[PDB]
Structure 1
Amino acid sequence: MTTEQRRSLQAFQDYIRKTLDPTYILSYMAPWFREEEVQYIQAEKNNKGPMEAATLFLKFLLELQEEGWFRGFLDALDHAGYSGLYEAIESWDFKKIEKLEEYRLLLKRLQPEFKTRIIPTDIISDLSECLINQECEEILQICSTKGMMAGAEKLVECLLRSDKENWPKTLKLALEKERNKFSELWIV
């Protein structure tokens, strides 16, 4: 049985990895994993990166034997703030996140001007709903300890990963108030 929904996961992966960082839902997931190997995933985060860490989290997830673990995954996403994935996996329908792929690749090709133009601090408060908490609390720590560009850069990185339905819109809302710049460059 379980194989059916895991298989639904297995075919339907790759949106997950490019949308997900396991560490947060790791904080949530402790009992379903051996206390060990959670660190494998984390060490993979700081070694290879969050995405590769995610695909490893998938490798470990899919092998999961015991019981009830699926709604564990779902609840983990939900309670950590990854919404559109909880939503999308409960309904198995991702169209939203794909229209996101549109705005995502747009940003990726537009990244440098984002870097120079933007001050990651003023706008973060506003589009914070669109981000994870650990996420939000970084950036500021980054541009606090490194610089406005580095911060912004990581901001983009976190944005490309976000599963939130409207985030390009709320972003546009956040700059269309604060000064302007990308208000003329970023459009919907």
Structure 2
Amino acid sequence: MTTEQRRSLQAFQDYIRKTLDPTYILSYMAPWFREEEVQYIQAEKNNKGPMAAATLFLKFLLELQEEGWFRGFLDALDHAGYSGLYEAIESWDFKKIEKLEEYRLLLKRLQPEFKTRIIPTDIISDLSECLINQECEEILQICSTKGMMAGAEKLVECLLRSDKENWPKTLKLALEKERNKFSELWIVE
């Protein structure tokens, strides 16, 4: 039944909390969740931002009783494009995602020069595969309304939540094409 691997889902909490935004998932999860619980998650993103909602989404997920819920979570996770988090939970092997923490830590550390030097509308097409589809729409939309810098900062937020094993390699390639003076700071091999 549901017990023996729920434990495993709890031990890997940290990874789900970091990569997931429940917003894109919840549309699929509608059968397993109370209507009010969805809205609560939705509200916690709005108020405290995606992680805070993820932590709350995690909390309700583990409270789920009616069977089939585990496959239902993965199924959603797949359709949303979180494949590679899905890939990871399916094999219970997070090695793939863990490798990313180095480059994720890096970007945080040079995050200021990313803000300055990156023009997102340039490199979004190449990065389109590393980000959730909806995250792109949100980014280019910020670019229009709040400016290039404000958009880069949002591209950084999303790059951190990305679970695609190769994105730091993806990004590098994008930065070598149309070349933004940040291209030099980012190093993979």
Give the TM bin, normalised by the shorter chain: over 0.9
- Displacement of 1:7: 0.8
Partner of 2:22: 22
Distance (whole Å) between structure 2 residues aligned to residue 39 and residue 4 of structure 1: 29
Alignment of 1:1-188 (within 5 A): 1-188=1-188
1:125-173 Cα shifts (integer Å, max 9, x gaps): 1110111011011110001110101100010000001000100000001
* CA RMSD across the alignment: 0.8
SS at match of 1:182: coil
**Residues 168-187 of structure 1: CA deviation (Å, up to 9, x unaligned):** 00000111001242221100
> Partner of 1:84: helix, strand, or coil?
coil
Please identify, of 86-95 and 175-184, the stretch whose mean Cα deviation from structure 2 is larger: 175-184
Structure 1: gaps (5+ residues): none
Aligned residues: 188
Deviation, structure 1 residue 90 = 0.3
- Superposition deviation, residue 27 in structure 1: 1.4
The one-character-per-residue Cα deviations of 1:8-61 (angstroms, maximum 9, x if unpaired) are 101121111011100001112111101111010010001111001000000000
Other structure's SS at 1:44 match:
helix
C-alpha contact 2:114 2:152 (8 A) present in aligned 1: yes
Percent identical among aligned pairs is: 99
TM-score (norm 2): 0.97
C-alpha distance in structure 2 between counterparts of 1:86 and 1:80, whole Å: 10
Q: Distance in 2 between matches of 1:131 and 1:154?
A: 11
Given that 2:41 and 2:53 are in contact with CA atoms closer than 8 Å, whether structure 1 keeps it comes out as yes
Mind listing any 5+ residue stretches in structure 2 that lack a counterpart? Answer: none
SS at 2:7's partner residue? helix
Distance in 2 separating the partners of 1:143 and 1:30: 32
Q: Write out the 4+ residue segments of structure 1 that deviate beyond 3 Å after TM superposition.
A: none
